[PDB]
Write a protein that binds this ligand. Structure first.
Ligand SMILES: CC(C)(COP(=O)(O)OP(=O)(O)OC[C@H]1O[C@@H](n2cnc3c(N)ncnc32)[C@H](O)[C@@H]1OP(=O)(O)O)[C@@H](O)C(=O)NCCC(=O)NCCS
Ligand SMILES: CC(C)(COP(=O)(O)OP(=O)(O)OC[C@H]1O[C@@H](n2cnc3c(N)ncnc32)[C@H](O)[C@@H]1OP(=O)(O)O)[C@@H](O)C(=O)NCCC(=O)NCCS
Ligand SMILES: CC(C)(COP(=O)(O)OP(=O)(O)OC[C@H]1O[C@@H](n2cnc3c(N)ncnc32)[C@H](O)[C@@H]1OP(=O)(O)O)[C@@H](O)C(=O)NCCC(=O)NCCS
Ligand SMILES: [Mg+2]
Ligand SMILES: [Mg+2]
Ligand SMILES: [Mg+2]
Lengths: 267, 267, 267
């Protein structure tokens, strides 16, 4: 999975006619049995998932939250598939992840409790990834909007995003940035995904295939950035330790950032 | 307490002549025995509490910090009243809350230690709410201003606000947003309360009855938002699952934000 | 160490010809054996440490990270010196600090794990201070830049900065702000230092002697803040408890901010 591109794509499990397209456009597809599908449509979604299989090495299935009758039906259904990685919505403790063993688990922390227990969830053995959800977050806080007038996330959402990035990285898990619900707001998605790439998120999860090209381009460093990385790496080959390059103190971790941009560009 | 409006108002306990005015203007009155009252005036303040009752169902009393002789004298003064809900300043541990049993406690976290321990404080059995305080926070950090030139809270205060909001919601406690000290700054207050309302705070604490109307208004969504909520919900009942509405991916938690808007207007 | 001014300065240990200049420019000097010095220059740095001593009372030595052969050689080298305070890079647990007993440790938290464990690190018995580092942080997250286009730290870094400030203050440890790598960027350094001084950081670490006067300046409150502090403290000497002053509500912690402004001026 860590070898798949950054362009991951949700597609509702009761929409099998879209599966192959989802697979085609995206790096990894998340087949959704949760919020994407109404309760009356779950069983059909579960039949589709087993009737219309995708490459299980590039497909994750978002099941329902722990302690729900739906999750048990999902697990019963997945029994009849070859999918080994699931996403857990409303992830709220290590126990919720651990009981999914031996499947690989991407924990979607999208509640206060989850936020408070982030590191615990990250540390759990089955965890291979962490994602965060702004909208469920606010909803469970009893709020009404995740962003301010100007489109930026409200503080608590920004806070949780950092918390999840830290928890995931501190335990060597993948970090996935939140979805961008404004389908046509290409510009905002781009800015969001450039920043996500810059701080070390591994994935930006998309909800529409038109988003994928934007995310992929956004995870390629700017031309001026690659130029810089090339320059500082070259200059460092004539240096021992800390030096000044173009007005700034360079040393090990900065050289590490440069290497990372060049790796991302090659990827 | 969950049943009162968002407009809470401090009034120092040594000004019994303002108690009825406060009760009249506010949803809940916080009678203050701590910072609002000089040490030399505390004993008279305590006398005021016993001599000028307010409806104990709409009235909270902020006592002094744990381990202080003042707190001991507050509790014995309080033995002569019907007040069963107290606010604990400088709340720094679960033990400080638990020791106040059997009273209900709103923890005011306004120290670094408090912030480090917020989740533990919120989980404590008597806790029914959490509030944060930016000014003691900065004071205890060794700092000198909680806000930038432009009026925004400095990063650490913004950080603690979110910490407390999450700690409270994670254990189902009321969340109270900090006081706005600039009494004539109606605009700043409104901007604060509007965002507090959006992110799930239940209350904005006020320090002047002129602020209640502002907080009450801010907690009722704008016309534009209510129109949208009506719209999204209406469409939602012809919808089954995730759909697109006005360019936005909509599902479950977005629907929940809309309900919450309408609930807040209804309230 | 809490008695020296806020202008701390890094100097790599491989460059002993600058030791006295740095000791002259700065309040405290951090002699560096880690990232400022290339692996092949380490042994000479160590030689230089023992052979070119500075006032141990105004010098801290940044050694290498826990569990490395380098750190072992560092301590071995320090045995022949009078330096009793060390800076610990990549601080990731209480155990890494505790093993440095009986030396005093400034923990430099600059990884996600460190951040997740900040309070644990802060509480450890040898810790006397905390510092954070944005660039190793970003590097370990798998990111490529600590700052946005406008120079502002990205969120996760801002988030980590507050974590450290809060962790260190919760256990009474010194707090040290991150270095400013853009040597020429006086204005940004000024703006960071000013804000660091406002939220209670004790120190801004510098990486070039030309930065120290900016930092010292930044930590001295502006003439306008000082006149305010004077004004408010004077008015307060005629008041009892909370009072309105120049449109703001004033009580204890506001009065404390004023005292701290005037203390920083006198210092
Ligand atoms: C929101 C949504 C229902 C919009 O559907 P829509 O109205 O058909 O959107 P469009 O009209 O723009 O679709 C255009 C094309 O993109 C395809 N498409 C859109 N979203 C897709 C998706 N999530 N997966 C696969 N294909 C998708 C459509 O099939 C269509 O393809 P086609 O024209 O070649 O036949 C759909 O985008 C979707 O399901 N998004 C994700 C929902 C989800 O999983 N939420 C759960 C977690 S947030
Ligand atoms: C700041 C403060 C001392 C100013 O008092 P002030 O100088 O009288 O200010 P104003 O002149 O504008 O007050 C006007 C009116 O509002 C009333 N008022 C102001 N603050 C009030 C309060 N907190 N509670 C009840 N009434 C209040 C006054 O009674 C006065 O009423 P009146 O005109 O009918 O006589 C006062 O607002 C106050 O005590 N606020 C709360 C402080 C506190 O509790 N701090 C501790 C925690 S933050
Ligand atoms: C980056 C660095 C090598 C720049 O070196 P430089 O190119 O010689 O810098 P300048 O040209 O601006 O030098 C200006 C003067 O200040 C001195 N100076 C610069 N940085 C200094 C430092 N960190 N300590 C002591 N003196 C320093 C120089 O020696 C020079 O003095 P001089 O004229 O008497 O010879 C130097 O700033 C440095 O080593 N900074 C700290 C690096 C470090 O320790 N990083 C680890 C943690 S971030
Ligand atoms: Mg969700
Ligand atoms: Mg206070
Ligand atoms: Mg570093």
């Amino acid at each position: 999975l860590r070898a798949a591109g950054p362009g991951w794509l949700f597609c509702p499990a009761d929409r099998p006619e879209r599966f192959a397209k989802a697979a085609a456009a995206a790096d990894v597809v998340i087949l959704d049995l949760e919020d994407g599908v109404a309760e009356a449509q779950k069983p059909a979604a579960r039949n589709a998932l087993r009737d219309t299989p995708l490459d299980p090495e590039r497909t994750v299935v978002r099941i329902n939250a722990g302690g729900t009758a739906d999750q048990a039906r999902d697990l019963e259904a997945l029994a009849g598939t070859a999918y080994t990685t699931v996403m857990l919505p409303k992830a709220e403790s290590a126990a919720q992840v651990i009981e999914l063993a031996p499947r690989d688990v991407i924990a979607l922390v999208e509640t206060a409790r989850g936020a408070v227990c982030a590191a615990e969830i990250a540390a759990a053995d089955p965890t291979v990834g962490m994602m965060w959800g702004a909208e469920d977050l606010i909803a469970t806080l009893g709020g009404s909007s995740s962003r301010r007038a100007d489109g930026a996330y409200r503080d608590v959402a920004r806070h949780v995003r950092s918390t999840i990035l830290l928890a995931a990285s501190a335990f060597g898990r993948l970090a996935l940035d939140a979805v961008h619900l404004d389908i046509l707001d290409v510009e905002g998605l781009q800015e969001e995904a450039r920043d996500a790439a810059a701080v070390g998120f591994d994935v930006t999860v998309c909800i529409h295939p038109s988003q994928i090209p934007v995310v992929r381009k956004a995870y390629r460093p700017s031309h001026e950035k690659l130029a810089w990385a090339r320059r500082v790496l070259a200059a460092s080959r004539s240096e021992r330790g800390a030096f000044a390059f173009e007005g700034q103190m360079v040393d090990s971790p900065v050289l590490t950032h440069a290497e990372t941009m060049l790796r991302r560009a090659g990827e």
